[PDB]
Amino acid sequence: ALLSFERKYRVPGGTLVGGNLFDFWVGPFYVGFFGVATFFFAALGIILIAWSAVLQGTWNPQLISVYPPALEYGLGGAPLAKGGLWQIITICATGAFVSWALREVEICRKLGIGYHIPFAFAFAILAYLTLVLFRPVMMGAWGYAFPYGIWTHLDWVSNTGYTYGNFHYNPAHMIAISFFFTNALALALHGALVLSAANPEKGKEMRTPDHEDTFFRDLVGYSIGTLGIHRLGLLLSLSAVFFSALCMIITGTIWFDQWVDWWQWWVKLPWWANIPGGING
């Protein structure tokens, strides 16, 4: 079925591939070529996980875990039972994510809007490929990749982190966290400002953008503006994920020692290295 205003937008065209062939809807969902692609890669990927859950002998969602090949296999293939299913599922997952983004591009073209949403999504895809492709390949083994399981993937985060001491000391991790925290601050403020203006004190008229600008200048002496806050959210969230990928691309490649010890570059600088007192002297 259709939203009351929807019919006038359901025109032909916008497709990147297959002309008018897949140019149709199933209920609310637009299909397109990349809809079919997404269904195929997703269905095959779900079958292979169920198969993996057979060879493992558990139908429990909290136990099922597809592990990469052991480190001894390096960057070669591996028996399905020992990390080959992970290898095929990882291809199927990349296929579905990239298909999903190109499907968003088709939806953009039909609606005559900008491509900002699939561009933003590509950053999430980039982070995933860092952990399961770029970092493993740079390190020489699929084994350095994370397993596909609810609790076993958490186990990997913990072991990978603690391999380099307290992972807090990764300076790209520090910057990534700052963007994640600031993003949430900015999302709370944005949600609250628009709602405080649309939903004022009982009996009063809807406020105006002017009230929203006024409120924030009164509070902190600056208002970024209604276009600015939307630019800022996109930038804060994409930055968090950029620095997330960066913090892990440099971990186990250019830096494989304790992250805490990296900070001696600063402490051992010639002009204060030998001065006594403080914590480091």
Partner 1 sequence: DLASLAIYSFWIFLAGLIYYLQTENMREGYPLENEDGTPAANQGPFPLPKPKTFILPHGRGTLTVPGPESEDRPIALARTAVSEGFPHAPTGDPMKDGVGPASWVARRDLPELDGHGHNKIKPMKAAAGFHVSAGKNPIGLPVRGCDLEIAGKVVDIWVDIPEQMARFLEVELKDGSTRLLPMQMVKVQSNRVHVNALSSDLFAGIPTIKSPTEVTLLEEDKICGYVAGGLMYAAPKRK
Partner 2 sequence: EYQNIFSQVQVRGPADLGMTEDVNLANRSGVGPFSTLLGWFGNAQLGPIYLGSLGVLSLFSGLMWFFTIGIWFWYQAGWNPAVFLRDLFFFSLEPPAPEYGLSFAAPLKEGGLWLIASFFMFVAVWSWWGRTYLRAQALGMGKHTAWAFLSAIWLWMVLGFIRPILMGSWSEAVPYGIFSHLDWTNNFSLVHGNLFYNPFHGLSIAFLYGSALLFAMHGATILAVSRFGGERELEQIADRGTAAERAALFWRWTMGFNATMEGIHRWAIWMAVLVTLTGGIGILLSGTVVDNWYVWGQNHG
Ligand X SMILES: CCCCCCCCCCCC[N+](C)(C)[O-]
Ligand Y SMILES: CC[C@H]1c2cc3[nH]c4c(c3C)C(=O)[C@H](C(=O)OC)c4c3nc(cc4[nH]c(cc(n2)[C@@H]1C)c(C(C)=O)c4C)[C@@H](C)[C@@H]3CCC(=O)OC/C=C(\C)CCC[C@H](C)CCC[C@H](C)CCCC(C)C
Ligand Z SMILES: COC1=C(OC)C(=O)C(C/C=C(\C)CC/C=C(\C)CC/C=C(\C)CC/C=C(\C)CC/C=C(\C)CC/C=C(\C)CC/C=C(\C)CC/C=C(\C)CC/C=C(\C)CCC=C(C)C)=C(C)C1=O
DSSP label of 143: G
Spatial CA neighbour of 107 closest among 98, 97, 117: 117
Q: Which does 45 bind (CB under 5 to 8 A by kind): ligand Y, ligand CDL, partner 1, none?
A: ligand Y
In whole angstroms, give the CA distance from residue 223 to residue 217.
Answer: 6
Question: Which helix (DSSP H) or strand (DSSP E) does residue 175 occupy?
Answer: helix 171-198
154 binds ligand BCL (CB under 6 A): yes
Q: Any contact of residue 198 with ligand Z (CB under 6 A)? A: no
Residues 12-41 that bind ligand Z (CB under 6 A): 26, 29, 31, 35-36, 38-39
4, 7, 8, 27: which one binds ligand X (CB under 6 A): 27
Distances (CA, A) of 85 to 46, 70, 80, 203, 213: 11, 13, 5, 62, 54
133, interface contact from partner 1, ligand Y, ligand CDL, none, CB < 5-8 Å by kind:
none
Question: How far, in Å, CA of 75 to CA of 142, rounded?
Answer: 6
- List Cβ neighbours of 203 (8 Å cut-off, separation of 6 or more): none
When the beta carbons of 204 and 269 are compared against partner 1, the nearer one is 204
When CB distances are held under 5 to 8 angstroms depending on the partner's kind, the choice from ligand X, ligand Y, ligand Z, none that residue 97 binds is ligand Y
Round the CA-based radius of gyration of the chain to a whole number and report it.
25
List the x/- string, 95-124, binding to ligand Y by CB under 6 A.
Answer: -xx--x---x------------x--xx-xx
The distance of closest approach from Cβ of residue 253 to partner 1 in the complex, given in angstroms and rounded to an integer, is 39
Q: Which residues bind ligand X (CB under 6 A)?
A: 27-28, 220-222
User: Which residues define the annotated binding site for a ubiquinone?
Assistant: 216
